[PDB]
Amino acid sequence: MELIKNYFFDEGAYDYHDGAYKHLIRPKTKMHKLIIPKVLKADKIEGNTTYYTIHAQEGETNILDGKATHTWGYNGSLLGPLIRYQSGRHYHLTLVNDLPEVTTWHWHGLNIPGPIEDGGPHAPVLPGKSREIKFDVNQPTMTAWLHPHPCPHTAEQVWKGLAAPVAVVNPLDDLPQLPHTWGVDDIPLIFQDRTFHDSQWDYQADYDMDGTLGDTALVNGTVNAEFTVTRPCLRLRVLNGANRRELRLNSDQNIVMTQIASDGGFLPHAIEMTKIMLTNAERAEILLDFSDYKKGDRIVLKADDVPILTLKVGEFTEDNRRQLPKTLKQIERDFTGSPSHQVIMEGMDDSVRINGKLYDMTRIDDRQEIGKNEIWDVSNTNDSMPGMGMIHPLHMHGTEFLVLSRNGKKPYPNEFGFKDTVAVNPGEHVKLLVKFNVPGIFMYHCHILEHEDTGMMAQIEAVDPNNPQHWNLKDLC
């Protein structure tokens, strides 16, 4: 009835129309057990402050069933742990670079001061050296993530294995009816694509200016992953951590995915679907129900046609199903009037640009006063004809916005919540309601990592009127 059974974005511009597209290959290895990221432990709690330490470091990981792979990871050989943050708490972080080149810690999703706490290009930690930052957190319940933002080297470092999941909990809008037992009924899905060259990742080998694609899907750094379900309800926190690849998530048994959340948090109401497309950097939290299944059944989840995660059903321990409310979260959406900001995304490959300009680190491209609600007009000037086009996902640092309209029409069924990343189809005009809460220099860019690297970034000053600020910007790219 009201069940989606399709993929929302315009198909004529999907990634697989590209001339140098790489199809995924289901690799020949044993079914590995799905790796769950460990929960990051606190060094200490002192007042409302919580002390964390995170090392960027090199290591070997047995991913295939042969040699190991040379990986980069946070507090480990590859990927990183679950980092919990709580709304209304102060956090002290220690960023230790144990890698042999400069990196940053961009907290994609966290609304914290820019451009240092933010973790964008401006804040660099040198090999050997480390960095300290403080910040308060004040935002809704949502799933975020951590990745490197060094310029122009992000893509390479993400490819090298740097990324981590970030859970943010707000006591005043959290839904404790949902599965929350991390590792058991509440799981991340960090989808990425890589190509192994003798059980080894070589970014230089696979590079494409329009975005680098791998031929082998990973999931939490696991290949041919299998997760055993021991409870009826499963909460998946899906994240497209690819450089370029779109994630068209489906199943052969068309199991209903009820989506409770997006990049910015819970949605007004739940949305039932059997498919879901995710562009880069976009998260979705979905519930699955295994009640009407028998023990031993496999529910294979596929990206397009290739299997990436298998959900095997065991004997259930308890029944973790709890009736939800109809409204998951209250959200004002009544906003009108002309756009005060315009972002024309244009080009492909070499040509990629924003408002005709490439990233310059010493330039402020826009300004907006914190607190106010201003409307944006993000557009894509790619050819609409099928295969002519391309889907760029706009990301904005230090904020969560609302999608107001797409070419005048209502946004897709699952976009009535807060987001920080949004797919723009060719020829489209997406209207966004943006509000900055903390001031500072923030980024906005295409989250296809090879585009950002090649200069699809721009900077905005979130202005506090009661604290005009002088900036000493340098370019380190």
Added chain:
Amino acid sequence: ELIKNYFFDEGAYDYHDGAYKHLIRPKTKMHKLIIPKVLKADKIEGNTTYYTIHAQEGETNILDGKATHTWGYNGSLLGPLIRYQSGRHYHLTLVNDLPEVTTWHWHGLNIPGPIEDGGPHAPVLPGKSREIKFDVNQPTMTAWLHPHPCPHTAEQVWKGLAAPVAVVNPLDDLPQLPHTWGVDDIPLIFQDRTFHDSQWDYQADYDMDGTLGDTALVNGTVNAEFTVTRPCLRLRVLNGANRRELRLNSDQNIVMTQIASDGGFLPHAIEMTKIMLTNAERAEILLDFSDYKKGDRIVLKADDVPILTLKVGEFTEDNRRQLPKTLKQIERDFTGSPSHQVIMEGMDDSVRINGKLYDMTRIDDRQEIGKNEIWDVSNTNDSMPGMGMIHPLHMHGTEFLVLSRNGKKPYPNEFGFKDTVAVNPGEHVKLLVKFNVPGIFMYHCHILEHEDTGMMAQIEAVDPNNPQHWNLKDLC
């Protein structure tokens, strides 16, 4: 608005008795509060879950000297948290490793009587063991396990046998509550004993009107201290005394929000700074430590003696979640004559039900399962002060509603389901009772020395579509 008084009639409180024993705050180090381990499942196959529980002997360091000789379930003393879920089948194995006969009464669980009931008819001999099956179909609530032989229940409870039982129903559970067992969700199993050379001797302390100890335990811990690491704390309080009433207070009159009673949640939450509990009663309360500083102690006391100290540490999370105004929907509209009468009478030796002592081979009442019948439990002890005692009526295999007390509305926290109810002298408490499973169930005074003496009786919960012949024997 805020209740600040104990509910029951004071003229009949335990401390009017001629041979009352005052509690003594003992001189020992502040011990860390013991949290019962969660019982592991042997296996799961289908909707069935397999448990095994040993009754067994052991030594426990309770004081800071010698150890004490204790009895316990899967351990030296007390027992673990036993989780049950509504809408599941359970297979249990009861292994008696004690040197005398015991049972496994699941006080609170609505399961068939009188075998799976764990009542007197279900003895397990020393060395031998027993198997039982049963489905669970009841609301979210806290129950407990204790032995119920004839007439040795009191001695065996005193010896250390008891355990907390959590029962969860997915369709009426409130996941807003603290549920992280051991962290923000803990039991409070209040008991009183007297140590004779760091040793329990029931024969020494015995009083037919109920045995009293001079030393409060809490989860078998003396001078317990629990460190709070989260703003909201869920206490599951249980009076596991033989006789002693539990007048729970605090010197700093912290507000206790009472979410639940013996049969589970209340229609709405009730705020109070005090709460009285008679034997076998349970109450789940929330405390809020937001407006406190680190290092503060919130001492809970039974009467004038401290039993637990809640030290405030650095908080890890904020676990406070808005509750709804109605915690649970409950029909209370029920009228018409009582079809059942229980006259509780006597004290000490005289104690009796409807003029009769417990006889194990006799059916004292009958009631058809499914139907809602009204009961009239009364106390004919003198109303005049110091001349009366409060007997708590318990009924096996059912959860009832308190409809009225001497015609008046029941106390502020009695609008939910209970299985135990205090009856003041001269009182007439009207109860709405329904049996869901048939069999031979007990109803009795849960002052354990009264039950042993015989303040007990038996009812046949009759299934009309399965009349049964009973071969009842006295296993006393």
